[PDB]
Design an enzyme around this catalytic site. Structure first.
Site, short mmCIF file in Angstrom:
data_model
loop_
_atom_site.label_atom_id
_atom_site.label_comp_id
_atom_site.label_asym_id
_atom_site.label_seq_id
_atom_site.Cartn_x
_atom_site.Cartn_y
_atom_site.Cartn_z
N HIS A 85 127.14 67.29 -5.23
CA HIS A 85 127.83 68.28 -6.06
C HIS A 85 126.88 69.46 -6.21
O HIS A 85 125.77 69.48 -5.68
CB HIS A 85 128.42 67.74 -7.37
CG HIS A 85 127.46 67.31 -8.42
ND1 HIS A 85 126.89 66.05 -8.46
CD2 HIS A 85 127.05 67.94 -9.56
CE1 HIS A 85 126.15 65.95 -9.55
NE2 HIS A 85 126.21 67.08 -10.22
N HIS A 150 132.45 63.69 -12.98
CA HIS A 150 131.32 64.42 -13.53
C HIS A 150 131.44 65.90 -13.24
O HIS A 150 131.02 66.74 -14.06
CB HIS A 150 130.04 63.82 -12.94
CG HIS A 150 128.84 64.66 -13.17
ND1 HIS A 150 128.15 64.69 -14.37
CD2 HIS A 150 128.26 65.59 -12.38
CE1 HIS A 150 127.18 65.57 -14.28
NE2 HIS A 150 127.20 66.11 -13.07
N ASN A 181 125.55 64.40 -18.84
CA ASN A 181 125.80 65.82 -19.00
C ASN A 181 127.20 66.12 -18.54
O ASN A 181 127.50 66.12 -17.34
CB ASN A 181 124.70 66.63 -18.33
CG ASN A 181 124.77 68.09 -18.68
OD1 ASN A 181 125.80 68.58 -19.15
ND2 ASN A 181 123.58 68.70 -18.78
#
Ligand SMILES: C[C@@H](c1cccc2c(-c3cnn(CCN)c3)c(C(=O)O)[nH]c12)N1C[C@]2(C[C@@H](CN)C2)OC1=O
Ligand SMILES: [Zn+2]
Ligand SMILES: [Zn+2]
Length: 232
Positions: A85, A150, A181
């Site tokens: 990512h 995520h 996060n």
């Protein structure tokens, strides 16, 4: 001395490798972000007499140290890397890789997001991954796009020779008490994306999270559980 290396065991700037299976290692590094220190994982997969790298070591200097540790411990050249990512723990260090002869790859979605946010940008686009459930082969791995979790672009990586599932940051370690996060996450879609991973890789033997300790398939259900509860 053989245990999976943990955050307080790795000074920022140093990298460790951990043998997962024949021809499969994780890499572990630590980095500071907003005044706290975190570990993060990536993957190394033997590709004949070359190596495929999954994810940087979270920063330029950490990634240089990763290359040096690979040369010391494995001694085969890293020829290609995939970032799973757009965040710095996945692409920070791509410029170092690109100057060390490594061809860097990511989906077009990752490349766009990295560019827009000012992160380092992999050179080559990985087509064929834009719809959830898509899969493509890349050397000794399969790349799979499970859907948003995520992040909207997160990819997972399967090593079929070893039944190793590298979940990246879409998958959390068993000790996790929060969804990590979540700044760029889709908490509503995340369980659905994890269910897709579960359905697609029922024979996984080792599951590696983006941060923290590997385990087995239970990491996937645990992730779904902690994300749902977080959303709650
Ligand atoms: C680089 C990475 C990041 C930084 C610090 C901690 C984590 C963690 C983490 C925190 N705690 N844990 C333990 C949970 N099992 C893991 C995870 C994870 O969860 O992947 N990524 C992290 N960034 C930064 C960013 C804020 C956005 C810009 N506004 C971009 O978002 C994001 O991810
Ligand atoms: Zn992230
Ligand atoms: Zn992460």
């Amino acid at each position: 001395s053989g245990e999976y290396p943990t955050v307080n065991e790795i000074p920022v700037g140093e990298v460790r490798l951990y043998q997962i299976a024949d021809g499969v290692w994780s890499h572990i590094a630590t980095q500071s972000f907003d005044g706290a220190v975190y570990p993060s994982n990536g993957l190394i997969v033997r590709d004949g007499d070359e190596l495929l790298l999954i994810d940087t070591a979270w920063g330029a200097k950490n990634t240089a140290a990763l290359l040096a540790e690979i040369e010391k411990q494995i001694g085969l050249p890293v020829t290609r890397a995939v970032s799973t990512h757009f965040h710095d723990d996945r692409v920070g260090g791509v410029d170092v890789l690109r100057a060390a002869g490594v061809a860097t790859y990511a989906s077009p979605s990752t490349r766009r997001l990295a560019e827009a946010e000012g992160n380092e940008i992999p050179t080559h686009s990985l087509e064929g991954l834009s719809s959830s459930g898509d899969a493509v082969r890349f050397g000794p791995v399969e790349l799979f796009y499970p859907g948003a979790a995520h992040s909207t672009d997160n990819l997972v990586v399967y090593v079929p020779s070893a039944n190793v599932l590298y979940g990246g940051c879409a998958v959390h370690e068993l000790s996790s008490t929060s969804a990590g996060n979540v700044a760029d996450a889709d908490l509503a879609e995340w369980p659905t994306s994890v269910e897709r991973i579960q359905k697609h890789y029922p024979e996984a033997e080792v599951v590696i999270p983006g941060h923290g300790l590997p385990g087995g398939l239970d990491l996937l259900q645990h992730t779904a559980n902690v994300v749902k509860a977080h959303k709650n």
